[PDB]
Design a binder for this molecule. Structure first.
Ligand SMILES: Nc1ncnc2c1ncn2[C@@H]1O[C@H](COP(=O)(O)OP(=O)(O)OC[C@H]2NC[C@H](O)[C@@H]2O)[C@@H](O)[C@H]1O
Ligand SMILES: [Mg+2]
Ligand SMILES: [Mg+2]
Length: 329
């Protein structure tokens, strides 16, 4: 039953792998599995370590983690500051065009309410992008109690994503990591857990409807990529990416006929995610966090992880997150 350091480290390294490997295909909407498999074989043979750079997905993840470690009770003012200073330090990591404005406003002296800049986005409608969700995994790694996971997922997201689609996408991604982490649930129970929580939270019900489609897809075999993309999405919008990440994870619990069986489940998850195209760094970073939490560090292979920028720092950070988790027990 008990959550291991291997699982927490697995989640963070999974997220990092997904971001670093997915970034290599970002925004190319048609990705063919053969290119992904070619990329992985080349990657495994690279003599130099650290050839793949992380993006805003990981930059913001690291800022979430530093906030949780500094303020374990969750301090949204501290976290807002870390987001804004990280942006300022490394503004070219690949941030969305909208969210840049949130950081500039948080960096100015005009706002005392750290949630107000996010509220003002897109004529006061707020962002429905997946940026809240891309960084949220660590909430589930720090807070064992589901009510904490839900409220802190929401609040962390609302620093940049004030639209319900934005922040509910973050909650869903946090819940997926939460349920992956706490046991090795069977597929059907995992989805039931998520659908149950999102029905309460949303309750026409956009995320629930996608989770229902996922249930249907998993009851079929040989579902073409095109049907997954058409019905779930591969977009920058949280609605069109978070369920897709969850599907990738659940799908890759079993053999995929197109992916050689010599790849483990976590590797398969990342390969499959990227093969869906679109927002590949974010979909893979989210699917990789879930898979990492589920399968743990045993499936984070040396040849894959050595390729990623900040792998050592990431592995270290897991220990400090794990301490947060254990204190909360
Ligand atoms: N309400 C609304 N209306 C119209 N367009 C929107 C809206 N919300 C988001 N968007 C579009 O989504 C884009 C991204 O949203 P934003 O809030 O700027 O960024 P995120 O943090 O969600 O983006 C995360 C993504 N960017 C790089 C990352 O790896 C993720 O793919 C933004 O520039 C717009 O084109
Ligand atoms: Mg990115
Ligand atoms: Mg992205």
């Amino acid at each position: 039953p008990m959550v291991s350091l291997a699982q927490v480290r697995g989640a963070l390294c999974g997220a990092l792998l997904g971001d670093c490997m997915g970034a290599e295909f970002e925004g190319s909407d048609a990705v063919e599995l053969p290119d992904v498999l070619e990329f992985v074989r080349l990657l495994e043979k690279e003599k130099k370590a650290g050839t793949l750079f992380y993006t805003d997905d990981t930059a913001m993840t690291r800022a979430v983690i530093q906030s949780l470690i500094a303020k374990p009770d969750f301090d949204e003012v501290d976290m807002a500051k870390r987001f804004a200073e990280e942006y300022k330090k490394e503004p070219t990591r690949g941030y969305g065009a909208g969210v840049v404005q949130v950081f500039k406003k948080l960096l100015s002296p005009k706002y005392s309410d750290v949630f107000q800049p996010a509220r003002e986005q897109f004529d006061g409608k707020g962002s429905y992008g997946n940026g809240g969700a891309m960084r949220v995994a660590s909430i589930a790694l720090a807070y064992p109690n589901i009510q904490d996971v839900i409220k802190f997922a929401r609040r962390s997201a609302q620093l940049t994503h004030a639209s319900p689609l934005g922040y509910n996408g973050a909650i869903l991604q946090a819940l997926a990591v939460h349920f992956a982490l706490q046991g090795e649930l069977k597929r059907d129970t995992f989805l039931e857990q998520l659908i149950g929580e999102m029905e309460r939270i949303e309750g026409k019900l956009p995320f629930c409807s996608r989770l229902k489609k996922i249930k249907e897809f998993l009851a079929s075999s040989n579902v073409p990529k095109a049907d997954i993309v058409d019905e779930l999405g591969h977009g920058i919008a949280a609605l069109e990416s978070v369920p897709t990440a969850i599907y990738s994870f659940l799908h890759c619990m079993e053999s995929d006929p197109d992916i050689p069986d010599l790849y483990n489940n976590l590797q398969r998850t990342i390969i499959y995610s990227i093969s869906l195209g679109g927002d590949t760094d974010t979909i893979a970073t989210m699917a990789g966090a879930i898979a990492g939490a589920y399968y743990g560090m045993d499936q984070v292979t040396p040849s894959w992880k050595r390729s990623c920028e900040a792998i050592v720092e990431t592995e270290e950070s897991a220990v400090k997150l794990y301490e947060l988790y254990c204190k909360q027990l």
